[PDB]
Design a protein around this ligand. Structure first.
Ligand code: ANP
Ligand code: ANP
Ligand code: MG
Ligand code: MG
Lengths: 482, 468, 483
């Protein structure tokens, strides 16, 4: 044929160089005699460079190669919920075929300037530190960043566990469907993540997309894009999705493998000069659509692993400047007891208040301050200290202690506000530093026993009247003395 | 029309083959028809054997070897003139706001030579902004470049929007705002806010043109957007003899795009990974922003500093072209001072007796020394009290408190958000008003009378209201 | 179809045009392309010629005709270039017609050898108290001006040029000093403003500007210093004296690194090519003081180098230090405090300038150099004890520091400099408040002009101070100090 078919010139390191395929499309999927697939990234004058999806032991020089006529795509739709798929949307969970609503390309234009609307609805993570200090809105990109083993995945996972509060209800505009993208991780780790979602009945509204460490580099490079299409089905249909990219560091590294083996020019850290574009194409797909276009949402929590805390390395630089803010984790805090290990001074949400439940905003406003003032005077923590700085130390320590939170234990907003209210207003100052944990427990159950009406008003109205404030004040003062 | 064929696709790099001696000039725009709209390629090199190498302005997924390629005969061109006002435009000059086509009278190429040496103005001169702090302490050069520093939560967009408003009302000049590597979320916010503020009016007349080169566009697009925005700005200067504003947010992002393009073309990178053409790339953009005999383009450019390293190639090269800096600071806004301009950090080359006159300089210099002595004494105030101060010192500190508050100003554009009617203070008034304070002619006036007002007459007016 | 006198473009890209033919071409020959753009034949290979463009790639296409010129890259030279602004190829860019040229010199001219030279012994009077007294410059010397961004580098050179108005309006040819200012990589508006400054001070009539600005192609930036040097050399070769300011070599070296990387020469330190020292060394060696046999002309060079963060240890800065005969280091910290010129006295040096310093200055500036560089070390240790002996040197040093401050565009005559230094060094300013030192100068010179004009004249005409004249300086000072 020479137009729809090709002969293998050479093959090695996951690359196969092919003669012919004259009518092929850039980034088109192809199929080799042996059954393995791959995509045509380089179209050159007399040959085509194809990256393979599988072992090259299967490809030989001289072997026939066929077009498929299809740019890479993936099945999409609600049929995927509770399923575990690979980068092309094949079921890997032993649960049978996927029912797709349709198919979507891996590469899709992000919504433009015009069809969007300011981020204004919360993604309630359930984490006191985050929701109060680094609030995330629907359609925002908030990066989770830090060294190995600092709790980056835990933040994402807690956010996914939390969504039950609304996914179990019938109001679809409040629901958050979750897409978790495992890139470069080991299978058992993913298997364990799945078992964990299952135990907290969170799989049923989650989709796992897995391109693990042993899978070919093109599959790891595709998996974020594929997953975004899966999430875009929700966004495009007046629903709301959250996507976790865990992680974009390892995705960059797969793209760098293909780029170097196709002999494209290297730059800083041997990344190709379109590695920025790779991640910006991916992340601008997270958006909050306008009313005209159904008000649907996609919210991204990309993960980046730093090396020795170095945010200046090439990939962290890229992603940091693309997203809307950073949640920064640190080992030092982790060992201190501070978990989740969020460095508050370095974390931000560019969206800010707009994405916060008003109730939480009414108490979180002054929390940001008391902590700022606490970080300046931190060193003064060792005999001759005046009135004001001794006080800043007393609040600071207790407010810091309130933000400690166990894994897999996300808290409702109405549980969050009384705790921060108590802290910020001084009701904790008298209580000794080691008892703040037991205080939280007892105070919540006391409120559920005796003041459930106030909890209910917080949850339902999302705001705090001057009447609520005074009721809270009374309930807090009442419990402190007991 | 001249026709080529695609011979190679590698990411955003595309190679096109044309017939004998029919090759398009380097920097010509080529066009491929797509089911969506059109893919534009810009010619980068002549490879030999009748083949050109190009950089794509959009994605190349789907391109096929042999596809028909059209030569437009020139560089990327953009619609220019009054018809661009209040419209959102992309790098190749298409409208991206769904308000139909820009029925412009001309299109002009985005690549053009800077005004000749002989065409240059021989004296630096001030562009009067109507903002007190700026005009007094760090005045903008007409036809110059100003580094705008400060991120979010400092009223940056309101500051930009007041310059747009003030230059139009004071000098009758339009503005062009160019988002280079702008977050789409923030272009949507900026557009929605310009309509709320009045600087864009769909039903009426707008004052600014928006050109956006989104982060998710390929490097070639993000590297050329600045030139697209600039050309619209140039037309107002050359054809209509205006003093024009050109906003570039962020100039660092124009640099990185150029690094990325260069890398993609196979050029060997220079220090710190930047493109070898770092300085000439910067000069080919910056040199076009200048004063001619017809009028002037003045550019306010948001500057990102990598790693906070001012010796990094990108800021160091950028800084060579800057004539002033406006520093917006959280420390100033936390004190409740708007615009949140740091009066000490903000520096201008034109703060000189030779350019602004002796009086202007002497007034400005004394103001700076006052605030500097105030800053240093902050420490002994916080613990010892104001009792431990000499006669000359306790007076200047009292005066500093007033000067500080007098540097604030309500903005006309922010009236929708605040309810406070905005003021545009003239340079002549700013100089006189502060001069009168420095000599001690308003020492009996309470501190709050200097807060959020215009000229000196606004101080006298408010003081009479706050007493009686 | 002369393919001996003519070429066809094979490929164009990255500021290189590959051309077929041109078989009779010389290495480093200028060529002309169809569109009018000019290039330089850089490497001649079997089958093709590689040509560096002096313009944009846009201006050249595959298959276009290229023509030989028969000349190695060269420029117009001679006295007629005075008061003219030109580009790197000597093309006029100021709208004033064609250049009146005496002839043409190549861009790359070999520097005079060991024999044709003679020690520097004639002053370049800058008019700057801090320079003339502490880091004096000889005719034929090379003195680096180095420091951070915005520290007053150009101002030192420009004040030196304005000063020559003193002799250049006169009759005596040996006393004249013609100036060549080379703008490499600067903004056009900066250069046009600088020219307007020179015209305003009547200094344009004796100087030549050569400009390759920030938007111009890299080879014209690389080129401008060399052609400017040949324009400088004409005066040198014809028994006259030129001063040449290369503003600045930092930007030249950035331009050369652009060609080198585009040509794929291996990057070394900070990605410069192995031959970036040679770029500056061959250039600066052309500044020389010639012997009596060669006509006694001289070319003095003031190159400018920009540091980053006041780091002089960096590659380009140290290459140039190891070529020139000393440096004037301008310190950002001094500049910020308002000490301008911001000369850091301990880091500045003139290697060969003493022998050329006007004797009157030399006499009243005894040890001043060693002293100031020592005062700063006593100042730093002051911020432990109020020691008697050290408090006096702290009182002198502050006065002397204030005394060396000088406004821009205000260069002083040697006869005006000597009495101020005398009053300082000898302690006559010791009882005067710090804030009035500036006021002292203007008042003291008026006094000396109105009253003791006879002394000023003698200093000017003799350049030395006899015992008699020194004692007459002592009276005049003390009387004024009193009142
Ligand atoms: N809030 C928490 N409280 C207590 N332990 C936690 C918390 N969050 C995380 N951990 C534990 O800390 C360890 C690191 O958590 P994990 O979420 O895996 O971090 P990570 O940065 O993604 N690690 P890796 O991806 O393997 O580099 C795990 O053992 C967690 O179970
Ligand atoms: N002696 C002086 N007194 C007062 N101001 C001065 C003096 N010398 C220079 N300046 C001013 O200081 C600024 C910088 O001087 P300039 O000579 O441009 O330094 P430079 O190091 O060449 N700057 P650049 O080339 O931009 O890095 C200008 O605004 C000058 O007018
Ligand atoms: Mg993990
Ligand atoms: Mg300079």
């Amino acid at each position: 044929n020479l137009n729809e078919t090709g002969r293998v010139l050479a093959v090695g390191d996951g690359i196969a160089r092919v003669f012919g395929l004259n009518n092929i499309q850039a980034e088109e999927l192809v199929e080799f005699s042996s059954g393995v697939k791959g995509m045509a990234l380089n179209l050159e004058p007399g040959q085509v460079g194809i990256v393979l999806f599988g072992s090259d032991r299967l490809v030989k020089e001289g072997e026939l190669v066929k077009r498929t006529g299809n740019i890479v795509d993936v099945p999409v739709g609600p049929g995927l919920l509770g399923r575990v798929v690979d980068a092309l949307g094949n079921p890997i969970d032993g649960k049978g075929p996927i029912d797709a609503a349709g198919r979507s390309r891996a590469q899709v234009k992000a919504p433009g300037i015009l069809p969007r609307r300011s981020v204004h609805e919360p993604v309630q993570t359930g984490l006191k530190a985050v929701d109060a200090l680094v609030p995330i809105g629907r359609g925002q990109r908030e990066l989770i960043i830090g060294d190995r083993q600092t709790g980056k995945t835990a933040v994402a996972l807690d956010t996914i566990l939390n969504q039950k509060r609304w996914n179990n209800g019938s109001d679809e505009s409040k629901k958050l469907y979750c897409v978790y993208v495992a890139v470069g991780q080991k299978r058992s780790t993913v298997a364990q993540l799945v078992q964990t979602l299952e135990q907290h009945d969170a799989m049923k509204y989650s989709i796992i997309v897995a391109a693990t460490a042993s899978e070919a580099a093109p599959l790891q490079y595709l998996a974020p894009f594929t997953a975004a299409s899966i999430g875009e089905w929700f966004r495009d249909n007046g629903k709301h999705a959250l996507i976790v990219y865990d992680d974009l560091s390892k995705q960059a590294v797969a793209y760098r493998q293909l780029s170097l083996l196709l002999r494209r020019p290297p730059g800083r850290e041997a990344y190709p000069g379109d590695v920025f574009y790779l991640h910006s194409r991916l992340l601008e797909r997270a958006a909050k659509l306008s009313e005209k276009e159904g008000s649907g949402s996609l919210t991204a929590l990309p993960v980046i692993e730093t090396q020795g805390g170095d945010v200046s390395a090439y990939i962290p630089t890229n992603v940091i400047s693309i997203t809307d803010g950073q949640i920064f984790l640190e080992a030092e805090l982790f060992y201190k007891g501070i978990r989740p290990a969020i460095n508050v001074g370095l974390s931000v949400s560019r969206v800010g208040s707009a994405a916060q439940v008003k109730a939480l905003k009414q108490v979180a406003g002054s929390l940001k301050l008391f902590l700022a003032q606490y970080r300046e005077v931190a060193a003064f923590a060792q005999s001759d200290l005046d009135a004001s700085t001794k006080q800043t130390l007393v609040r600071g320590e207790r407010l810091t202690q309130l933000l400690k939170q166990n894994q897999y234990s996300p808290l409702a907003t109405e549980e969050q506000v009384p705790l921060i209210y108590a802290g910020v207003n001084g009701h904790l100052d008298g209580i000794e530093l080691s008892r703040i944990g037991e205080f939280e427990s007892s105070f919540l159950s006391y409120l559920k026993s005796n003041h459930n009406e106030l909890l209910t008003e917080i949850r339902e109205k999302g705001e705090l009247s001057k009447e609520l404030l005074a009721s809270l004040k009374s309930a807090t003062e009442s419990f402190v003395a007991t | 029309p001249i026709t080529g064929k695609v011979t190679a696709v590698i990411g955003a790099i595309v190679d096109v083959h044309f017939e004998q001696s029919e090759l398009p000039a380097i920097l010509n725009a080529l066009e491929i028809k797509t089911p969506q709209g059109k893919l534009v390629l810009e010619v980068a090199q002549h490879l030999g054997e009748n083949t050109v190498r190009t950089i794509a302005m959009d994605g190349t997924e789907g391109l096929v070897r042999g596809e028909k390629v059209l030569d437009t005969g020139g560089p990327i061109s953009v619609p220019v003139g009054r018809e661009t006002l209040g419209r959102i435009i992309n790098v190749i000059g298409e409208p991206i706001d769904e308000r139909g086509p820009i029925k412009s009278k001309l299109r002009k190429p985005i690549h053009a030579d800077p005004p000749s040496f002989a065409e240059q103005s021989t004296s630096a001169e001030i562009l009067e902004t109507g903002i007190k702090v700026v005009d007094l302490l760090a005045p903008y050069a007409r036809g110059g470049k100003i580094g705008l520093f400060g991120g979010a939560g400092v009223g940056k967009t309101v500051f930009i929007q007041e310059l747009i408003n003030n230059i139009a009302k004071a000098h009758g000049g339009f503005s062009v705002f160019t988002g280079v590597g702008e977050r789409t979320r923030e272009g949507n916010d900026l557009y929605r806010e310009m309509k709320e503020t009045g600087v864009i009016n769909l039903e009426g007349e707008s004052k600014v043109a928006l050109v956006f080169g989104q982060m998710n566009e390929p490097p070639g697009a993000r590297a050329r957007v600045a030139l697209t925005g600039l050309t619209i700005a140039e037309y107002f200067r050359d054809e209509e003899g205006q003093d024009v504003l050109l906003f570039i947010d962020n100039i660092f992002r124009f640099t990185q795009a150029g690094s990325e393009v260069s890398a993609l073309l196979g050029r060997i990178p220079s220090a710190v990974g930047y493109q070898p053409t770092l300085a000439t790339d910067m000069g080919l953009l910056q040199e076009r922003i200048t004063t001619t005999k017809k009028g002037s383009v003045t550019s306010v450019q948001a500057v990102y500093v990598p790693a906070d390293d001012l010796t990094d190639p990108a800021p160091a090269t950028t800084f060579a072209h800057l004539d002033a800096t406006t520093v917006l600071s959280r420390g100033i806004s936390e004190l409740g001072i708007y615009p949140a301009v740091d009066p000490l950090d903000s520096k201008s080359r034109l703060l000189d007796a030779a350019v602004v006159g002796q009086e202007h300089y002497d007034v400005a210099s004394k103001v700076q020394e006052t605030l500097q002595t105030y800053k240093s004494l902050q420490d002994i105030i916080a613990i010892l009290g104001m009792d431990e101060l000499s006669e000359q010192d306790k007076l200047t500190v009292e005066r500093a408190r007033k000067i500080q508050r007098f540097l604030s100003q309500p903005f006309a554009v922010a009236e929708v958000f605040t309810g406070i009617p905005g003021k545009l203070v003239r340079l002549k008034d700013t100089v006189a008003s502060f001069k009168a304070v420095l000599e001690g002619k308003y020492d009996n006036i309470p501190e709050h009378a200097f807060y959020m007002v215009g000229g000196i007459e606004d101080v006298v007016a408010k003081a009479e209201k706050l007493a009686a």
